[PDB]
Design a protein around this ligand. Structure first.
Ligand SMILES: Nc1ncnc2c1ncn2[C@@H]1O[C@H](COP(=O)(O)OC(=O)[C@@H](N)CC(=O)O)[C@@H](O)[C@H]1O
Ligand SMILES: Nc1ncnc2c1ncn2[C@@H]1O[C@H](COP(=O)(O)OC(=O)[C@@H](N)CC(=O)O)[C@@H](O)[C@H]1O
Lengths: 501, 502
């Protein structure tokens, strides 16, 4: 009784003299710890002369099987799986070792000493088509709690059967540290990192500098009602909904081309599949020579570049494929030359396809809904065969006060949205860069010029012609992959009903 | 009788209607078409790079801000400015059809206005020492596309001057500069400072990516933490993150192995000092280690050494640093091929042996260094090791956060570290507790509420890799690299207990 459970909980005191057991990191000094420890990613990349001799590898026990003399371990690290096997082939039939190993809880972290070789038929699961024969296995971190759900279940595509295996969004978000271990979730957030990298490097290559502007404000920035309020040492303040005012102030200071990658905070009480209370905004602001279209074409080049880099062979292709295995969706498509529609044209397309009913004099007054966004996206996919397009010339009355209107037709503005799979990823405009026109537009929008005093003032000592845009990082990733919910592309999502974890 | 002024006023306000037939005036951008075609417009950075081409054979167009105008009778001298670059442009009316109205209009342009100039570049006998473009433009046309509307709060000539005690030296004080930040940021030194800030972010990110890190973004709206700003989050009590600590650890417990984040954090402590802000940009790293946390420590070290090396090489960074030093002189930042590392005990003994610190032996383990004492240790180490950069490890466990792993041999000491630049702290970090039972025990030891940290504690319950991390102040690193006297110089729009604006 005590006998067997003593070996099930066996702690190793000398890794040389023994071949299995729980071990503190302190004790891992076989021949004075000249251990060359490998991880699955390194192994994958070199094999797909590590394999001429025994090696040490660390990983999580993704799955365990045990029958008689044989025992299979699926060892996992990030995206990489490998089958390791304990058959007591060269272990002197310890048998107690078999009991110890076969009782290890899933997700436990293990250091295996073993020999690589390629099997006749590898497992279809392990993307490492080699296997390891276990000469020694030590557990440096034992799973302490039963998982909230099994990874095999959370990794599986949803069949939607009556008695089907399905892990709820709530369950996953509540237990995010486990949810993130699925192959698709790991890949999703590697791709999020990739988008940030391509974005920054493109702008840096085009002579931009990165800026960091405050999120604690004295005023609203993108509107008062939807801002979170704070007590700032007995001043009333707000969280930034956007770095809009500061990135323009930086252009007014001469920085010429700036970007920011930073959180913003939105306090709208909206609970939708695409709305967050906190998200990462990629912001750009820059000057133009004579026409604001110069900048629009530039923003377009940027996104085409992002798509080109995300769709390339190598790592990104494996990441996207791993996402698509659980969440299938056709490849994101874009044309060599991006289609650009005017808002009027887009609305007339919706009318022509009988999705909207509007007389002429009402078109510029209609404010396009998210449903109509997706309907326009379907129309353009069928006619232009792309998932990516631009709408310009939004009605002035539907855009913020800093948007420059067309002087010859003030009912429309020099403004633009970009769309992926029919849904908005980017919003931006030519800015009003004349301080008097700016004050006129502020009063036309019934805003309080005193609360905007420092921003306005930044235009009083001249102002370059400039434009800019703001982009949702989580939206871009969501829509590139076709995912159903933006909570899949934010690490720890924030929404009106979720502050935790 | 004297209505002639009315005419003069018409001249000073002249709006140009056709740039093909006129040589000066205010213009709409929509009217800058030369013979119905598009102007090839240059900026001063392009000119600087080319000349220091097609620029010397014919008239060109250049845009810039009027940094200065000097009127001298039939000549006027305009200094045009863009970024770090300036160029002298000359209007001589003998060459401009003896048109006195044009001269009158040019002289009356306010500083900082934005103009497009059409003219011919040539190299003068001896160039103006203030302009780093050593060519001059001789003006054939000049059009103003944005006129300064308001008297400046202070003059840029004064805001650019190095501070001295010489007679009639005008200083622009901090309160004034910060209040009119969009003007202050136009000084050459301030422009250069924030280019160097961007440079630090780029080098940090690129180093970590080349070493197989991924960038993460973790929430700043939190549910639970008294140095935190509070928020009402839809009838919940929320707080602003002081640090992404818990989430970057949670990511390591999720398998991400190597993560960094560049993001704001928010600190509500009521402290007004030269080096403390209420909002700043934190550079955070968190990563696993094989068997010894010192692996990661040496990695963080090479990261900073790499940053220093990249900041100190090449034309661009060299000119940015030289431009800062022209206004704010300071010895070049110094470091060693082997970074010195001291234990906390060692550092304390050094301070005591040098007469800078007196303590009872009993109080040696509880002592917490002041910032003045930080600078004193910095002076000692500068004199003995000839470096501005060094590391302290092995702080007492009682002085470090609850997630800090202590030495199991001697639990009073922890596996923690700070890095120092010019004697002042830039980085804080440690080996983490990665055993969930030890974590619960330490949380109990610090009289913390486990319920408030549940989601975090739970993330250690399904195994935890051995790991460590660090947090870095971006503005502090830049300030101490340049030797600047105040962190408000290295934060674009500073936040402190008495400054919410701009
Ligand atoms: N609640 C939200 N949750 C998640 N993502 C969101 C959310 N709201 C917006 N986005 C993303 O940010 C982009 C720009 O935001 P806007 O509010 O349209 O514009 C702005 O904030 C202007 N300052 C832009 C500019 O003119 O520079 C959107 O296209 C979308 O991808
Ligand atoms: N008020 C401030 N204003 C400007 N910069 C500041 C301010 N406070 C700190 N810093 C910078 O951040 C680094 C680490 O922050 P700490 O609070 O020491 O540690 C932390 O935040 C831990 N979570 C780090 C970790 O262990 O990961 C400092 O060295 C300094 O450069």
């Amino acid at each position: 009784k005590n006998e067997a459970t003593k070996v099930l909980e066996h702690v190793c005191e000398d890794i040389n003299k023994e071949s299995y057991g729980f071990v503190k990191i302190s004790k891992m000094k076989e021949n004075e710890k000249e251990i060359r420890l490998f991880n699955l990613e390194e192994i994958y990349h070199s094999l797909m002369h590590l394999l001429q001799s025994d090696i040490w590898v660390r990983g999580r026990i993704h799955d365990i099987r045990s029958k008689g003399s044989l025992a299979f371990i699926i060892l996992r690290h990030k995206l990489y799986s490998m089958q390791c096997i304990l058959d007591i082939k060269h272990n002197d039939n310890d048998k107690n070792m078999m009991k110890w190993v076969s009782n290890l809880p899933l997700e436990s972290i293990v250091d295996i000493k073993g020999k690589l070789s390629k099997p006749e038929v590898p497992i279809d699961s392990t993307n490492i088509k080699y296997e390891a024969h276990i000469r020694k296995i030590f557990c440096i971190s034992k799973t302490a709690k039963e998982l909230p759900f099994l990874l095999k279940d959370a990794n599986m595509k949803e069949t939607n059967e009556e008695g089907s295996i399905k892990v709820n969004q709530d369950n996953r978000l509540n237990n995010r540290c486990v949810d993130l271990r699925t192959y698709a979730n790991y890949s999703i957030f590697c791709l999020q990192s990739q988008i940030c990298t391509i974005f920054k490097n493109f702008l840096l290559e085009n002579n931009f500098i990165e800026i960091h502007t405050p999120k604690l404000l004295g005023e609203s920035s993108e509107g008062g009602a939807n801002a979170f309020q704070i007590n700032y040492f007995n001043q009333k303040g707000f969280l930034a909904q956007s770095p809009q005012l500061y990135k323009q102030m930086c252009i007014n200071s001469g920085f010429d081309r700036v970007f920011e990658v930073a959180p913003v905070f939105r306090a709208e009480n909206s609970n939708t599949y695409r709305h967050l209370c906190e998200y990462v905004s990629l912001d750009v602001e820059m000057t133009y020579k004579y026409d604001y279209l110069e900048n629009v074409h530039f923003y377009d080049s940027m996104f085409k570049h992002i798509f080109t880099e995300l769709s390339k062979g190598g790592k990104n292709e494996m990441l996207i494929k791993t996402v698509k295995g659980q969440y299938p969706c056709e490849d994101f498509q874009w044309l060599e030359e991006t289609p650009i529609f005017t808002y009027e044209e887009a609305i007339k397309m919706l009318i022509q396809h009988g999705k909207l009913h509007l007389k002429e004099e009402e078109i510029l007054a209609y404010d396009m809904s998210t449903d109509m966004e997706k309907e326009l996206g379907k129309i353009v996919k069928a006619s232009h065969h792309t998932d990516y397009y631009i709408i310009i010339n939004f009605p002035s009355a539907l855009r913020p006060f800093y948007t420059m209107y067309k002087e010859d037709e003030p009912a429309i503005s020099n403004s633009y949205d970009f769309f992926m799979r029919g849904e908005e990823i980017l919003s931006g405009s030519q800015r009003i860069s004349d301080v008097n026109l700016l004050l006129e537009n502020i009063k036309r929008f019934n805003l309080d010029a005193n609360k905007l005093n420092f921003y306005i003032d930044s235009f009083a000592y001249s102002s370059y012609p400039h434009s800019g845009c703001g982009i949702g990082l989580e939206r871009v990733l969501m829509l590139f992959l076709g995912l159903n919910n933006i909570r899949k592309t934010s690490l720890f999502p924030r929404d009106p009903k979720r502050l935790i974890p």
